[model samples]
Target: VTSVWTKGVTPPANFTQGEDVFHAPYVANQGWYDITKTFNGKDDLLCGAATAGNMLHWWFDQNKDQIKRYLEEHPEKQKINFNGEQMFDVKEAIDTKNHQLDSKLFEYFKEKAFPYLSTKHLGVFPDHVIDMFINGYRLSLTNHGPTPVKEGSKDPRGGIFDAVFTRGDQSKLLTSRHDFKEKNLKEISDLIKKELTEGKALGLSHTYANVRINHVINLWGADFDSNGNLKAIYVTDSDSNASIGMKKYFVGVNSAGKVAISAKEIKEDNIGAQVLGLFTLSTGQDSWNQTN
Candidate 1:
């Protein structure tokens, strides 16, 4: 059986019910900002893997054709070199064939493979995602580019100009966010409660389904298993162990060992708000929160 830690550390009295809870050190917005500062708006290049595959295929095809044509053109030459003695550099031929085959295979995949990887469509919230992408692209150019900017006239700030603008956009997305429906909130809460209860019953760990931001339930101090697997956790407004009280709400634990949640942050230009927040740091390996 697994060991249990002390429980019943009453949440801070002024903890504002669902408002106060432990938070992750690096917020999702911060990660978004970093991505924005890194790779936004860059043109796709035929370098690295693309170029390598292209070159390997080109060489292989060229060599094979050369040999085939040589034999075809000089049947007399083939007869005289019957032991295939004329086939010099057999190893080179083999190498070319192997690499060429691999190259062709990769090309086939590029043309016909279905996407095996799936991801949550944050694009459901479009303006936010677009802003993050643009910002990341701009940052990559300014900080790393002495190379000519591919997308057009280069901004002097290296690509620093992109970061500044993207950041502004990210801020706007966060502020202008709208309220998700109560039905959605109920669905989320139910899932959380199911996982947490099951985990506890089986003496297994528990965590949330959403890990990018801190959830209201996260402050209660549950975390994922060491292999980065999500341990399901439950959240309920009436549950005494829960960190927050709500009619219904829940989120997932991030693989990074943090609790993520969404909330609102209002502003003037934005006039709306939603936060992809995170709460982090667990006490030892125990599944309980320390007294605050």
Candidate 2:
């Protein structure tokens, strides 16, 4: 977290490659790639969870020892139990081999935790996970069901949620889903720079057009020109299967300040290159509370 968010390889990541190399975001730990291999639910629709997980891993990498001691304090937390079934023991959860949280632990958290709180899609009997983690996750919520209903039965996903997962930081919308004007793009660039300069874990919410993919990606850093205009935005895309560094998007604003990218901009096709809207996350709540 001490590393400023600028274009280059930074800590909590082991990629020795340049900033332009796009690899699986999980190469920092490699456990997640293993986890993803076995995870059965939401194969193609985990961008949001992966974004938050990316930030969480970055924080975990820096605060691992502290958080480890924190979790050890609450032995009750070592068990991952959903409803009443015992999922796994965190004692066996911490993978010292990779020096990171085990994939099984991440499996439970993403399935039962934020960004995809195990809710079935409304009116459809399917896993209806919300598309954004920007929605403040309530640590106090115990009612465990798919939809936002009173099950009277409350079982909190109490492992990481209690140790490190948070209600999330306040987020700002770069533009309305209907509007991505120049001023909004300027604001987006400003917000990214400001949050990164403050050393916060930030992410971006993007809706790629035509293909109509509402994707969320983890923000690693940003680059600007001498005049202080955005030159490129760097990110680690979980979907990219990156095992090293982050991807750089060469972006610029139009005459009216509208953010524009082409097929070559983000490895997307021209027909599907349209970026509808974007959102920004501030920081994690307990980011500075690792002293215990």
Candidate 3:
């Protein structure tokens, strides 16, 4: 049985704090995406998996003793069912070197937060696990990308994907059919500034031709001009630069509204159009799954 149940009737008192505690992976889905794509001949579409894995790993890394004690007391929590498959009996849930548990937690987390079998629809919200917080620690995002925890859902939790999270990269009103306006630059700049400065990281993306996120990246730092104007945002993609774990770069949009992340010898552009958005890596305590 899932250990945690739905939380307080009203929002948790500290819910709005936005809990900037995040430990972003130095590298993300790029290597896996490439290998899986090269072999499968289709995009792995694991951007969501990467982002989710990053947070879970960070949690496990920091909470090893708590997890160990809980599992020692309640081993049942280690067993998980996923997509008609089984993630049974964990040997290690606090793995930091390999992150195997983080990977398994992604599959487990995806099972509920995402309601589909295949990634045929838009794709998992990078912050999909936010919902289980209120349902589990009482956590929840909306337009600003902070987990909404209160806007409402079929369930009591806030920031459910359809209610808020998915809007960033999939919804027609938020992405896809929407056109990128000049105002979005300031918005994006302010967003990165607020989150990064406040100790929250994000999953940034480039939506190809305004369709879907072609690549997902982790935001680390930001650069600003002297007058408090935005200059560029720093990122770490498991991109080709995966070999350079510390590889990061300044990504800026051309005045023409075309965005490109330039570094190394490569210039990765947003293809035909420039559409940008992000979801917070910041979340409350553990969710329904793996919670002590």
Which digits, one per residue and each the tens of the lDDT, describe model 2 over residues 1-292?
1123722225335434445443334444532222231234433455545554555444445555765675666666667676888865554434532322335545645545543432332111111122122222223334223233222222344423333432322122111112243355556666667766755555565555314345556557667766555666666655553344355566654443346542234332322233443433333334436453
> Which RMSD does model 3 reach against the true structure?
12.7
Clashing pairs in 2: 23-242, 23-243, 24-241, 24-242, 24-243, 119-146, 121-128, 182-257, 182-258
TM-score on alpha carbons, each prediction: 0.17, 0.60, 0.53
For TM-score, the strongest prediction is 2
Q: What do the candidate models score in CA lDDT, each in turn?
A: 0.24, 0.43, 0.39
State the lDDT of candidate 3 residue by residue for 160-191, as single tens digits: 22322222222111111112244555566665
Which scores greater on TM-score, model 1 or model 3? 3
Q: Supply the TM-score for candidate 2.
A: 0.60
What does candidate 1's lDDT look like per residue over 1-292, in tens digits?
1112113222222323244432222222110000001111110111112222222222233234543444455343222122544322223323433332222322322222211111221101212212222222222312321222234432221111132222333231211222222233244333333433332110111222434221121222232344332232222211122123211122333334233332222223222112232211111112111231
The stretch of ten residues in a row with the least summed lDDT in candidate 2 is 122-131
User: Which 10 consecutive residues of model 3 have the lowest summed lDDT?
Assistant: 1-10
Clashes of each: 34, 9, 8
Quality of model 3 by C-alpha lDDT: 0.39
